[PDB]
Design an enzyme around this catalytic site. Structure first.
Site, PDB file in Angstrom:
ATOM      1  N   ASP B 208       5.778 -23.296  54.573  1.00 51.65           N
ATOM      2  CA  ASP B 208       5.312 -22.528  55.747  1.00 51.65           C
ATOM      3  C   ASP B 208       3.883 -22.103  55.516  1.00 51.65           C
ATOM      4  OD1 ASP B 208       4.694 -20.719  57.831  1.00 51.65           O
ATOM      5  OD2 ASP B 208       6.644 -19.684  57.648  1.00 51.65           O
ATOM      6  N   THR B 234       2.318 -21.769  62.332  1.00 48.72           N
ATOM      7  CA  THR B 234       1.984 -21.256  63.645  1.00 48.72           C
ATOM      8  C   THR B 234       0.639 -21.846  64.063  1.00 48.72           C
ATOM      9  OG1 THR B 234       1.038 -19.266  62.613  1.00 48.72           O
ATOM     10  CG2 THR B 234       3.303 -19.154  63.365  1.00 48.72           C
TER      11      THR B 234
HETATM   12  C1  PLG Z   1       4.943 -16.968  56.792  1.00 47.13           C
HETATM   13  C2  PLG Z   1       4.981 -16.731  58.286  1.00 47.13           C
HETATM   14  N1  PLG Z   1       5.625 -17.604  59.098  1.00 47.13           N
HETATM   15  C3  PLG Z   1       5.673 -17.403  60.435  1.00 47.13           C
HETATM   16  C4  PLG Z   1       5.054 -16.279  61.001  1.00 47.13           C
HETATM   17  C5  PLG Z   1       4.975 -15.964  62.484  1.00 47.13           C
HETATM   18  O1  PLG Z   1       6.075 -16.017  63.359  1.00 47.13           O
HETATM   19  P1  PLG Z   1       5.826 -15.490  64.880  1.00 47.13           P
HETATM   20  O2  PLG Z   1       4.792 -16.412  65.493  1.00 47.13           O
HETATM   21  O3  PLG Z   1       7.244 -15.594  65.377  1.00 47.13           O
HETATM   22  O4  PLG Z   1       5.269 -14.105  64.761  1.00 47.13           O
HETATM   23  C6  PLG Z   1       4.376 -15.387  60.192  1.00 47.13           C
HETATM   24  C7  PLG Z   1       3.715 -14.198  60.829  1.00 47.13           C
HETATM   25  N2  PLG Z   1       3.595 -13.088  60.235  1.00 47.13           N
HETATM   26  C8  PLG Z   1       2.946 -11.958  60.889  1.00 47.13           C
HETATM   27  C9  PLG Z   1       1.853 -11.413  59.985  1.00 47.13           C
HETATM   28  O5  PLG Z   1       1.720 -11.914  58.835  1.00 47.13           O
HETATM   29  O6  PLG Z   1       1.114 -10.492  60.419  1.00 47.13           O
HETATM   30  C10 PLG Z   1       4.343 -15.613  58.820  1.00 47.13           C
HETATM   31  O7  PLG Z   1       3.696 -14.720  58.009  1.00 47.13           O
END
Ligand code: PLG
Ligand code: 33G
Ligand code: 33G
Ligand code: PLG
Ligand code: CL
Lengths: 442, 442
Positions: B208, B234
């Site tokens: 990821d 993302t």
């Molecule tokens: C490792 C990881 N994977 C996926 C997502 C995001 O999923 P959504 O698009 O459903 O929010 C994040 C977001 N993390 C939010 C942050 O680090 O601020 C993340 O840190």
């Protein structure tokens, strides 16, 4: 350090396809029961910088700060939501974060029953949605049949929900949720009788009203909020909002349900909300409460009646021989053609509709019907008198479909070579484009 | 039969809050490591009429017709995606339909392991995501610990992935998926050693890279594609796209995976794709492939290096004493203040950052650090020289946070009362607004 060039210059290739989509939409008679056309204000919200913001959590309960303006937006949206569906902040709550109808349903069903939980829904080939527990002989097609244990009810021989079958199954199978509200169902629903069946088994009552949401808000159809524990709806179909969804929950009947639903959505399933979506919903839900939107929804039903009537006057059969709502399911048996064939024919004349099962269909293999709906065309200005032409066009398309089949045979690949360059379809397409092209267009 | 008057006239109340959100964003020093600012072209795509369209299924395999232009859009997005991440049409596939990061992870993990399958991820308090299998003593917080059976690895005492602990756990636990790639991790990842651990158990390797996606694309950090079975990202963080996600799957290493993933997304989890999202993703991915974007991404890392270095010069500690990427985790123990407090102080001065754990915390209500990142500010044009000011502002905020705590006590309820009307914060806020307000703004 960015590129602030207009979409036209920065990415001509994409803009050109988009310019085309827009023309296809402008020049189509759109009878997809689940489709609509957003107004410019909704689309401004969708393209707003409010989606730059991470806002995980709930208002006044965020993980990050700088979320006060976001918090107002979300709370406005919850408020406009409950107002629209004529419910008190005191008995009902809503979660406005679910990204789409399928997500909402999964989230809400999980909230109520957990993993390995038991649910009842209408079969897909009968008009239930995929997320009402759809599985096949060979596969657990929807997660709702895999993460949950599901059983599927059917409609009777006349195209109506067989409540007596719903009972037989419910007592025998003992679900903790029974889902009603459908993808393809031309009649109103007896929620009271659903509410009574659930009570004998102690199940929750789940009403998915994505297709008839405006009818519910406008007090034109039966009120599910009178009986149900959870109500879900998309915001993009007849409701005419962005692509998003709502989860409603009856606090009064169920204390403990609010935190259960809010927690299911985040942090069990979702991450950051899409605030541009939440904003666009807000914009539309306001439009919904206005008497002007009640006009529109009424106009939707009037067109739907005028259309069902005109089709019958042309000796075309309808499942249940009518509609109480925005959608009609045409029965093609008397012409010996399938819905896929007619879908193919309508495609060639800029008429958007989709194939659909009828009760007499054994499997989803060879749908004998097509589903049409009036929300999109009503938005584009069509009045009852215009249903004649639309009915006139579908009758003509059915006849051409019957002719092409006698000429090219029973197999679809075979059938399909008849369409390109057909003098009749080109004449028909032209009539359609010419009428569609000049209709009001948001 | 619609209302086409501009957002301002139609719903002034919303327009105001939105205009306020925009001013707050423009006048903030945004250090949220997961945040960015989309260009105007990406936002034209988000508000394009292409989202009127139902498009269930996949290109040239749609349930409905009239989907040829949508098909062109989706195939362009898959193509621009695979190339941006330097992989061949022939070895890698990509699904561009997931509505968000969390959905993408849940869908992809489902595809690989099914219901009640075993997965391994980094603990949240260590820096993993919620969808990496997070749970609590007494509560399965993410669906990933409920629909799946999960075990959570930790970082060591110096803030690094303890690869030896991963092995001890994996061999004991025997997962079918081990996830790497994190929410808050200031260092690059040894995917090769993860590939080797999976091999000893025959688990898949899930990467990821939502936080570091641009670095990977631009060949600045390690390549997960060399070693991984599945890569998610993302499109909204450092990549600078819309709120959406991608699932990448290695076909050459796994025949069958392409159907497994495409079917997980739809029809297991999702219904209609959001084509405006897909269009916006296509638009951004084009930009990602330009060398101008490579420059921006380099600038992100340069800024992050300079910021870490400036903070160090001001005698502030950093977890791992540095960063390989876009984000820094500040360790506050030497000042005896929580991240919660500093977050509060930063909120008051228009500095956006969030609290974060350090190795030496065990509980999550006590976090001793803060996470900061440089993509947003880099987008806005800040260069290495500007990192000094940002470090100076953060040092001054830490200072005020220490002073307000000695005055008001160690309890956050009390601490907060010191913030409003504070002469020094208002002074600091103005310096921030004046610098921030005047920076380039898409
Ligand atoms: C490792 C990881 N994977 C996926 C997502 C995001 O999923 P959504 O698009 O459903 O929010 C994040 C977001 N993390 C939010 C942050 O680090 O601020 C993340 O840190
Ligand atoms: C495409 C889609 N999404 N949700 C639906 C359907 C819809 C549907 C039609 C057809 C056909 N032919 C096939 C599917 C479908 C979709 C995914 C997997 C599958 F096995 C079947 C789904 C269409 C026809 C009207 C809507 C349906 C039905 N029947 C219902 N009730 O629900
Ligand atoms: C909000 C969120 N989503 N995913 C995350 C987090 C994040 C987080 C931080 C904090 C704190 N303090 C708390 C949470 C959190 C979020 C939801 C439920 C929960 F129990 C805890 C989540 C963010 C906030 C700073 C980093 C995190 C960490 N640490 C990681 N690795 O992953
Ligand atoms: C009753 C019902 N519930 C939920 C959904 C799911 O919405 P999303 O596609 O936003 O996930 C649908 C979609 N129905 C598609 C159609 O009737 O054409 C639906 O008909
Ligand atoms: Cl969107």
């Amino acid at each position: 350090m960015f590129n602030n060039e207009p979409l036209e210059q920065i990415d001509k290739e994409l803009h050109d396809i988009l310019a085309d989509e827009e023309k296809r939409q402008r020049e189509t008679i759109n009878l997809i029961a689940s489709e609509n056309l957003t107004n410019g204000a909704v689309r401004e919200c969708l393209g707003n910088r409010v989606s730059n913001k991470y806002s995980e959590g709930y208002p006044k309960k965020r993980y990050y700060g700088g979320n006060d303006f976001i918090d107002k937006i979300e709370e406005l949206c919850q408020k406009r939501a409950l107002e629209a569906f004529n419910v008190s902040d005191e008995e009902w709550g809503v979660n406005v974060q679910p990204l789409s109808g399928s997500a909402a349903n999964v989230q809400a069903l999980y909230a109520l029953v957990g993993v390995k939980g038991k649910i009842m829904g209408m079969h897909l080939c009968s008009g239930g949605h995929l997320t009402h527990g759809f599985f096949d002989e060979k596969k657990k097609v929807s997660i709702t049949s895999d993460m949950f244990e599901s059983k599927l009810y059917k409609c009777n021989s006349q195209g109506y929900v067989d409540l007596d079958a719903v009972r037989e199954m419910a007592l025998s199978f003992k679900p903790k949720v029974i889902i009603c509200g459908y993808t393809s169902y031309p009649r109103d629903i007896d929620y009271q009788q659903f509410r009574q069946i659930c009570d004998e088994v102690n199940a929750y009552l789940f009403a998915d009203i994505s297709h008839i949401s405006s009818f519910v808000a406008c007090n034109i159809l039966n009120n599910p909020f009178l009986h149900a524990d959870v109500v879900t709806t998309t915001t993009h179909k007849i409701l005419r909002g962005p692509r998003s969804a709502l989860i409603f929950f009856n606090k009064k009947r169920n204390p403990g349900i609010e935190q259960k639903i809010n927690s299911a959505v985040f942090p069990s399933f979702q991450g950051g909300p899409h605030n541009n979506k939440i904003a666009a919903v807000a914009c539309q839900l306001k439009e919904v409460h206005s008497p002007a939107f009640k006009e529109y929804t009424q106009q939707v039903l009037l067109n739907s009646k005028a259309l069902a009537k005109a089709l019958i006057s042309k000796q075309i059969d309808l499942v249940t021989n009518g509609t109480d709502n925005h959608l009609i399911v045409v029965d093609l048996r008397k012409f010996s053609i399938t819905g896929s064939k007619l879908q193919e024919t309508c495609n060639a004349i800029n008429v958007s509709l989709n194939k659909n099962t009828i009760p007499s269909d054994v499997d989803c293999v060879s749908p004998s019907g097509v589903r049409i709906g009036t929300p999109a065309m009503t938005t584009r200005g069509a009045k009852e008198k215009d249903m004649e032409f639309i009915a006139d066009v579908l009758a003509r398309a059915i006849k051409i479909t019957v002719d092409l089949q006698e000429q090219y045979g029973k197999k679809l690949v075979d059938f399909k070579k008849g369409l390109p360059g057909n003098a009749q379809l080109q004449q028909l397409k032209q009539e359609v484009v010419t009428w569609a092209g000049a209709l009001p267009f948001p």
